[PDB]
Every structure is written in C-alpha cells, then in structure tokens.
Amino acid sequence: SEIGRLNNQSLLWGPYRPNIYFGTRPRIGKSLMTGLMWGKIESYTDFQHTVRYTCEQNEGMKGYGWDEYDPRRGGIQSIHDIQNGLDITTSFVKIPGGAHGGSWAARIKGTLNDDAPKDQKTIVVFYVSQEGENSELEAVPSENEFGYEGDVILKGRSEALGNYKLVVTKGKGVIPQSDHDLSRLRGPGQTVVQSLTYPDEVLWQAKPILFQQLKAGIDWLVENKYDVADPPPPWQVYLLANKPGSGNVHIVQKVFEGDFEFDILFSSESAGKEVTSKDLEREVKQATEVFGERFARVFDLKAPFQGDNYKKFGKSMFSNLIGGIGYFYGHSLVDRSYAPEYDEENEGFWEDAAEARARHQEALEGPYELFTSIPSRPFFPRGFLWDEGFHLLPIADWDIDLALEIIKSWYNLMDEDGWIAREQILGAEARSKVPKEFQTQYPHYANPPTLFLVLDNFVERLRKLDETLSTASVDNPEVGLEYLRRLYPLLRRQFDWFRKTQAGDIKSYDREAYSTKEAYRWRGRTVSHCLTSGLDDYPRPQPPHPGELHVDLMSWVGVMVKSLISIGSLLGATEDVEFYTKVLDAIEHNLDDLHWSEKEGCYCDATIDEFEEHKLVCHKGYISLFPFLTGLLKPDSPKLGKLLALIGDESELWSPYGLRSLSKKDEFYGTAENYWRSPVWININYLAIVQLYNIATQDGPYKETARDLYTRLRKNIVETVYRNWEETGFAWEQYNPETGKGQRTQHFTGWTSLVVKIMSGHH
Ligand SMILES: CS(=O)(=O)c1cc(NCc2ccc(CN3C[C@H](O)[C@@H](O)[C@H](O)[C@H]3CO)cc2)cc(-c2cccnn2)c1
User: Fold this and answer.
1) How far apart are CA 310 and CA 741, in angstroms?
2) Which of 339, 458, 532, 594 is the most buried (most CB within 10 A)?
3) What torsion do the CA atoms of 633, 654, 387, 319 make, to the nearest 10 degrees?
4) Ligand 1 proximity of 605 Cβ (cutoff 6 Å)
C-alpha cells in the first residue's frame, strides 16, 4: 500500500501515446496531453499531405521506434521519414519530485537526410490540450508584436497536477524570413502560439483542429487582398497569426530552414526548482547509462548471440516492446443484450448470432482506463488480452512491478461475471482508427488467459528508488502475497467464467470419459474463423457445431488451474486448492479421453458426426501440440515423445525458420487467407522453446531429443527474426516458412519481441 503509492508516483508520466509519433500524457483520464507534428512545405498545397502525426507504415517512412526506453526514466526514439527528408530524434526524460508525479522534458532534433534540399522548410507544431472542468492553462504573451523571439511559457493548474509550467524553448536552427508585404501584419517569420477552446471531448482531434486554424489564416489572406499576382511564400501562408491566451488547446508552431532542435520542459511546481535544458541533457545521458547496465544484467544474451550485433538487435526489440506502453481512457462499445442466440446451442448457430448482432443493441459504457503494452503502433495501438500475456514475459524480467501494474490494470476491467473484453478500445481517439464493424465487444467472447503465464513467473520468482521500485514486489514477500491476495478472487472469477461460458457438451452425446465435467468449446466461431482462440483461421471442425470440443481451450483451463493451485497454496485457500486438484486431475484424464488420437499421434479438436458420434478432427499444427505447449504433459509421457517426433519432423511442422503453424501435409496448408495455416509465429514458437528446454534440463527418456530440438529451434527463431530486422529494420507479425521472409504487419512489438527472452535463455 505504501509501495503502491511510490509506484503510482513513479509511473504517472510518460510518452503514453504510442498511437502517435510523439506525445505525452499522464495516467489520468482527463488531463494535460501533448503531441508533436512536422512536415516539409514546398508548395501551397503540399503540407496537408506531408504533415505527420498519427503512426503509420508505408513507402514514405523508412522506419521508427525506441532505441532505449524505461517507462520510469524515459528514452530516445529515432524516426526515419523519407517523404519529409528528415531523421528525427525525440528524447524524453522524467525528473522525480514534488507531489504530482514529477517533472519531464523532451528534446526534438531534426536532421535533414542527404536527399533533402539543404534549404528545406519544415513546419513543426507542438500541440497541447487540457481536459477537465476546473483547470486552467495560459500562454504567457510575448514582448514582441507578431510572435516569440524566444521561449513559449505555458502556465496551468489542475486538481490532478497542481501548478505547473510547460516551456517550449526557442531552439536552434535557421528561421526563414519573409520580405513580403504580409510581414508588416504577420511578422517576417517567428514562433507563434494560438490559444483556443473546444468542448473537451474533441481536444484529441489535433490534426483537424490545426487545419481549421490554418484554413482560417488562408481565408484571411484571401479577404485582405493577398493573391496570385504576388503571393507570400508557402511557409508564411501556413504560419498562424500569433494569438496566445487562455484556453484548453494551445498550438505552438515553428518553421525551420535546414536542421533544427528545441526542448520541451515540464516543471511541476510542487517540486524543487524548475527543469532546465542542462537538466534535460544530464538526465538523458544518465538514463542511457542506467538502461545499458540493466540490459546487460537482465538480458544477458547467451551463445551464439553474445555478439554486439545481437545486443543491438535485442535492445531494439525490447525497447520497442516496452516502449509501446500506453494509457487509454474512455468508453468501450459492448453488446449487453445477452441475446439467447449467443448461447450457440443449435446447429447453424452462426446464422442466429448474425441475427442477434443485426439488432445492434450495443451501447457505449464505462468510462474505463487501461495501462498496457500493445501489439503494434501503426496498426493495433490498443490492449489485446492474450497478446499481453506474451508482452509481459520480457517486461516482467525488466521490471516485475511494472508488469504487475499492467496485470492489475487489466484485471480492473473484469465485469461482475468474470469477463474482460479481448480487445480494449477505450474512447473516441482509440476508436478513430478502428472500423465500425470491428468495435463491438461481446461478453461471451473469451481469449487465451496468457496473463497467468506471467503470474506463474512471478510466483516462482517469489518462492526463490527506481532500482528498488522495479523489484519491490518480490524483494518484500509481504507485498507479493498481498498483491496475490487481492487479485486471487478475480483470477478465480475468470476461472469460473470460462467454465460457465466456454463449457463443452459431454453429457448429451455418446461420449465416454473419466470426467463428465471437463470439456470446452470457444464461443464465437464462424464457418472459417475462430477469433476468440487467437488462431484466427486455423482449420477447425466443419461445419462448426455445438458439439465441438477444442483442445487448445481445455489446455488453457489447465494452465489456469495450475496457477490457482500455486497461488491458493501461497494464500492457504485449502478448500479451493482441493477442488482445483480434482479439476487438474480430470483435465489430465480428459485431454486423453476426448482429444488424443492414437491413429495420428497427436491431440485433435473434436465434433459430433452426421450420425451424432464423437469424431476427432486432426489438423497437424500448433493446435495439435497444445497440451505440450501449455506445460500439462509429464516428462516421461509417451504422448509427449510422439509430439516431439511431430515437432521435429521437417515434412510436417519443422522449417529452417521455426515451426509452421500448420503441417505441409494438412489439406488446409497455405489455403485462403493463410494466416495461421502455415506461417511461423513467434508467440507459439516461444512456448515450444520454453517447453523443450524444460524436458531438456530434467532426467527422462526425451532429455536429449529435447536438448537438440531446443538448441536448433532457438537458433532458427532468433536468426529468422534477426535477419529480417537487419534487412528491413522491422519486427514482423509472422515469418514465411519457405523463404524466411517477414510478412503481414511491421512494427509488431508485439510478441515478436519475445526473441529477446529466447536469446537470454536460462528458463
Ligand atoms: C486489414 S488489417 O491491417 O489486418 C486490420 C485489421 C483490424 N481488425 C481485425 C484484426 C485485429 C488484430 C489483428 C492482429 N492480431 C491477429 C492475431 O491472430 C490475434 O491472435 C491477435 O491477438 C491480433 C492482435 O495482435 C488482426 C486483425 C484492425 C485494423 C486497425 C485497427 C486500428 C487502427 N488501424 N487498423 C487493421
């Protein structure tokens, strides 16, 4: 509770706007937010097309991301913008002090690349907004007529932040000067500020708000007889008339010719003295040193990746993953009808659920907040539930207390029933990027509970001030068990929810098995998809059917029970721990009785026939290995040995680049969208690698096959991801098993970053 508050104060500020190139906000719903924009201007019409704000990936952008980041200290981002002929650095740094979550500073540096005209004009904007009823923010006017020769100071106050100043410094670089008539009314060229107000809920729409002000400037030109007989230069036509004041939006605009840089200094008044540029430089150099020392300790890359090339690779994958951390706030869109069609209980259920959806009873609810890492800045800058379990495995190593914060944040979303939506789209900003037909969440939709994996790691670590704070929840056992105590009931609630909502049907068919209880079927499947399982288009029983059972789902339930055993045991929930033991024992038996195929040598999902009998449906691939991947099989199990055969078999799963999602022998190989029907995916490869290492560092019959497989798979996965990074600068979503090429989306940090932990090893 004391450590909680120090943790709160430490993590309050950051560049928690991963959906944009660079911006800051604190972990507060309605507060002070900033964002960077820039774009070259060569003509009277180009700036609207060159300006950058929200993250994307296309031919115009070579690459971007964090070179180093720790959300407690700050870091350095590099942006390589081809369209704008610019290489940009954004350094962000936090300075603890006072009562309001400390201070921070950022340096924005732009260097023209070799291709750029040496006299390029670049428009740079720093956009500042503040939400809240009783808060103030004011631009201190300049001494000069038309703008600022020097720094722009914003004075503001709020309940959340107390008093603060935000300074945008004069910076360094040529500022262009205009000889035109207009300069007599608009100045020759200088930094300008517009202070505006809009209703709070639209402050986020920085691009349109800016353009509306640019447009009003141009309309003013037109009305005041500035025309094509004698036009002012483009960059002056797009320079806002200076009008500072008070409001909830403040636009600070600069134009530079050539290279440039400028600082942003946020000074929390309740702290000591105010933040300077010399402070920024010192704290930046200091963060880099701490970052370095920590990486070497936490991510000690083992053979054969100890080389410096692999270190830089590892730093990039890690920094981008942990650098994705966002704070999201607002309403989510949920169908709360619990239409009976969603029980999916007859044949052809998918058509019924389509009928219910077509009622559109979904409503906004909340608001909610979420502090989480994300799969990708340009495409998926929001919380995804099973993804986050993978994101936190490397993050927890770095800073267990951060990871627990993020777990707590997710768990705080769980409704009364035990449901967390698998995709968290919080507020209009988060919604803007996401197509309407994809926003609505459904309380019957599960997603893998991979967050338990992180919990498991915490538990084993538990059994055996930024320095201190990162590890306080393990160094103080008292704190640990207390965290577990408070979360334990939500864990159980989620357990029970799986069993009530994702229940399969044994009792109503000719189905025999050790337990009449244990059987699971993901709700929400369509003819070609099962989105809730995480493996979108992995082939399942055709047609889908209320009788289906899914071996991945049962294995996840297995993961959960096992975690509940350890956590219950740590808390002495004896009555609970005994029930869990009966479920574990029953899932073990039932995985065999309902899922094992002796004929095929692997696990399979099941349905019920045209003739109403249990049928196995075997599609050799990730799904086939689940009981192994999820840690459920004994190290001497013959079944495990056969899965090891399947895994290593080059003609089924084993490619030089990692395990294929689907066997080359399956009829569904490389068909359709071919998402999970052949490509190599790091998250599942990671689970294989960890399980091989387990069977490998224990006496048993398969110790040495596992040792060989472990060695080679670790090598193949790391090298594929590394080679692609070296060539393209990106982490990719998935990798082509025939060519080794990364494909689908880029900037996937993202569970692809698991590679840093594969390299570092020692599970
Ligand atoms: C044409 S698109 O670029 O594919 C595309 C698609 C969709 N909607 C569906 C979708 C959602 C997430 C994933 C990735 N991935 C698939 C994995 O199978 C799951 O296991 C993972 O949990 C899941 C998360 O990592 C894939 C598909 C949204 C946007 C978008 C959203 C905001 C802003 N701009 N664009 C773009």
Assistant:
1) 19
2) 594
3) 120
4) no
375 closest CA partner among 534, 521, 504: 534
Question: What token pair was written down for 85?
Answer: 């002929």
Which numbered atom of ligand 1 lies nearest the CA of 386?
A: 22
Q: Which residues of 129-138 are buried (b: 16+ CB within 10 A; e: fewer)?
A: bbbbeebebb
Task: Return the best residue to mutate from 380, 743, 749 for the ligand 1 pocket (most ligand atoms within 8 A of CB).
Answer: 380
Tokens 């052949």 correspond to what residue? Answer: 678
Domain ranges of the chain: 13-294
Catalytic annotation, pick one of 456, 536, 593, 600: 536
Residue 718, classified by CB atoms within 10 Å of its CB into exposed (0-12), middle (13-18) or buried (19+), is buried
Q: 436 near 336, Cβ under 8 Å?
A: no
**What is d(CA 94, CA 114) in angstroms, rounded to the nearest whole number?**
33
Q: Is beta strand 326-335 parallel, antiparallel or unpaired with respect to 192-196?
A: unpaired
Provide the 8-state DSSP code for 200: G
CB atoms inside a 10 Å sphere around CB 83: 15
Phi, psi (5° rounding) for residue 21? -65, -45
Distance separating alpha carbons of residues 45 and 68, to the nearest angstrom: 37
Residue 221 class from Cβ within 10 Å (0-12 exposed, 13-18 middle, 19+ buried)? middle
Closest-CA residue to 271 (of 95, 136, 25): 95
Taking the mean position of all CA atoms in its chain, how far away is CA 185?
Answer: 47
For ligand 1, atom 17: residue with the closest CA: 534
Q: Which two tokens stand for residue 236?
A: 């002056």
Long-range Cβ contacts of 90-93 (<8 Å, 24+ apart)? 90/15, 90/21, 90/22, 90/36, 91/280, 91/284, 92/14, 92/15, 92/22, 92/24, 93/280, 93/283, 93/284, 93/287
380: CA distance to ligand 1 center in Å? Answer: 6
Q: Quick one: CATH architecture of 13-294?
A: Distorted Sandwich (2.70)
In total, the chain counts a number of residues equal to 763
Resolution (angstroms) equals 2.3
Question: How far apart, in whole angstroms, are the C-alpha atoms of residue 339 and residue 345?
Answer: 12
Alpha helices in 148-243, H assignment, sequence order: 183-186, 206-223, 234-237
Residue type, 242: N
372 bridge partner residues: 326
Determination technique for this entry = X-ray
Instruction: Report the C-alpha gap between 720 and 648 in whole angstroms.
Output: 18
Contact present, 107 and 89 (Cβ < 8 Å): yes
Number of helices and strands in the chain (H, E): 22, 26
- The answer to whether 274 is a known catalytic residue is no
Q: Which residues of 528-549 are buried (b: 16+ CB within 10 A; e: fewer)?
A: ebbbbbbbebbbbbeebbbbbb
Q: Is 733 a catalytic residue?
A: yes
